[PDB]
Design a protein around this nucleic acid. Structure first.
Lengths: 186, 47, 195, 49
RNA sequence: CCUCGA
DNA sequence: TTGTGGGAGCTGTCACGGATGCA
DNA sequence: TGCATCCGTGAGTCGAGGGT
């Protein structure tokens, strides 16, 4: 019978769990961790209780289940990011993190200037003819695929790519000091 | 962009229906981010 | 009482029971009773009645129901407001809020697992009390029983703590802030100045 | 999987729940944390018959 | 949080 | 997943108001 | 129902650097 043996499980095992809470507390030192460990132990025990040899000492069996559930969770942590909680991560910590990040803590000024014209670049672009400037803008800034930038401007792919390569050349004619002022000459 | 002229600020109790109308999806997993790729696990606390 | 007579009543433990009570609760009936006790009574009965009437009348005068005092769903604050940052050493730093939500999640999932496995009622009750206590921590840690602790035995600052004291949002980030276009240095006298 | 009570309203002195349902907070701690049962409803007519 | 400054 | 198995600190603070609980 | 006890509240401002 299945359910009769679950009632037998309750009757025989529950005081064992009363003492196993103290065991898991001794081996985890955190009462919340101990309750979690004990409930995990009871999950595993009730799942595999049919495999228990009746009449023997269930104390040692359940204590081994507890020991193995502690041993498996210690290894589960070794594969997940080591986390350490704090009330409030500090500014030195926000800053240290920002030192190795792809964006960092940007200032209002930085973002103000990015929203203002890049005067060297704006004038180089305005030098180019309108169609060269457009074919360069879409492709090089807005990353549209070549057939789709042909869909814009209503011109075939060949015309768009001729305009793109020749406007890139011309704009490289200008901007020659800007590329040296910045790191693009390398 | 809010023009910053509010008349009133009201509290009530959130109904579980309200709590669900706010939510963009249920968090189901306790994982935060993968240690290998530093990317946020799906259905996790940073999904 | 359940083996015999079990089909004449419903009884239960926990917040589900409190929810069922709040369902069958007649706010108008109890409000009228309390008003009666206040109008025609005296002494300590009058005092207790006025106290309880503040709550009841507030719940009936506003159209919101007391069911909101029991949660089937727990919201989750945006992750930028509970950040996680890498530190020198390959270790990470998380806000306490993430550990608290993570315990809530672990306990809810273990509860679901137990409910599916048809576990003993005692073990499932253990898991339900544990879920309740972890949501107690997430909302206001330390208010009932032992506070959930992190390393070094420190109580995890909960969503309540984020608002209280000179550390909380009010006195630390809304009534005073850190500002741009500002500096600081040592002062010397300089008597040559005009006022 | 199971509903919970907002600790602001159970333990926040004076217990708003305890005033709402007219329960002493000690009994509320017994109920909410699985120390004692509570009767949610009773079929009076069937008991009578 | 620690040690310090007014 | 089988002979036995219960923590680490804690307190060397204090005035005040009102619920809470006890009888 | 009458209190005694317990529990929950609050306890100055701004700086520096160090960095589990």
């Amino acid at each position: 019978t299945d359910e009769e043996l679950t009632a037998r499980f309750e009757r025989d095992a529950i005081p064992l769990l009363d003492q196993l809470y103290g065991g898991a507390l001794r081996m985890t030192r955190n009462p919340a961790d101990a309750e979690d460990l004990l409930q995990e132990t009871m999950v595993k025990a009730y799942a595999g209780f049919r495999s228990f040899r009746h009449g023997t000492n269930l104390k040692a069996w359940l204590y081994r289940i507890l020991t193995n559930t502690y041993i498996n969770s210690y290894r589960k942590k070794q594969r997940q990011p080591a986390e350490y909680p704090t009330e409030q991560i500090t500014d030195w910590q926000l800053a240290s993190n920002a030192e190795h990040s792809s964006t960092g803590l940007r200032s209002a000024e930085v973002e103000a200037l990015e929203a203002l014209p890049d005067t060297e670049i704006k004038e180089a672009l305005q030098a180019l003819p309108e169609e060269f400037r457009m074919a360069v803008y879409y492709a090089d800034v807005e990353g549209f695929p070549y057939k789709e930038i042909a869909e814009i401007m209503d011109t075939p792919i060949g015309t768009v790519m001729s305009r793109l390569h020749r406007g890139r050349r011309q704009l490289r004619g200008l901007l020659a000091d800007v590329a040296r002022d910045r790191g693009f000459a390398r | 962009l809010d023009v910053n002229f509010f008349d009133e600020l009201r509290i009530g109790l959130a109904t579980a229906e309200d709590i669900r109308q706010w939510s963009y999806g249920e968090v189901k997993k306790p994982e935060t981010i993968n240690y290998r790729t530093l990317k946020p696990e799906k259905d996790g606390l940073f999904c | 009482l359940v083996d015999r007579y079990g089909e004449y009543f419903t009884g239960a433990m926990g917040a589900e029971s409190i929810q069922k009570l709040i369902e069958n609760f007649d706010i108008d009936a109890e409000a009228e009773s309390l008003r009666d006790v206040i109008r025609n009574g005296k002494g300590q009965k009058k005092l207790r009645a006025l106290k309880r009437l503040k709550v009841v009348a507030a719940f009936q005068q506003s159209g919101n129901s007391p069911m909101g005092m029991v949660l089937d769903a727990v919201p989750v604050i945006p992750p930028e407001l509970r950040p996680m940052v890498q530190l020198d050493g390959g270790r990470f730093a998380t806000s306490d809020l993430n550990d608290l939500y993570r315990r809530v999640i672990n306990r809810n999932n273990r509860l679901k697992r137990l409910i599916d496995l048809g576990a003993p009622e005692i073990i499932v009750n253990n898991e339900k009390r544990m879920l309740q206590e972890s949501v107690d921590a997430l909302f206001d840690n330390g208010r009932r029983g032992r506070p959930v602790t992190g390393p070094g035995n420190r109580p995890l600052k909960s969503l309540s703590d984020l608002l209280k004291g000179k550390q909380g949002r009010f006195r630390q980030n809304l009534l005073g802030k850190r500002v741009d276009y500002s500096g600081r240095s040592v002062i010397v006298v300089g008597p040559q100045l005009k006022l | 999987a199971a509903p919970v009570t907002h600790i602001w309203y159970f333990k926040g002195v004076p217990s708003r729940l305890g005033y709402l349902l007219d329960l002493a907070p000690k009994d509320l701690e017994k109920i909410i944390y699985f120390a004692a049962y509570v009767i949610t409803s009773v079929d009076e007519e069937m008991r009578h018959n």
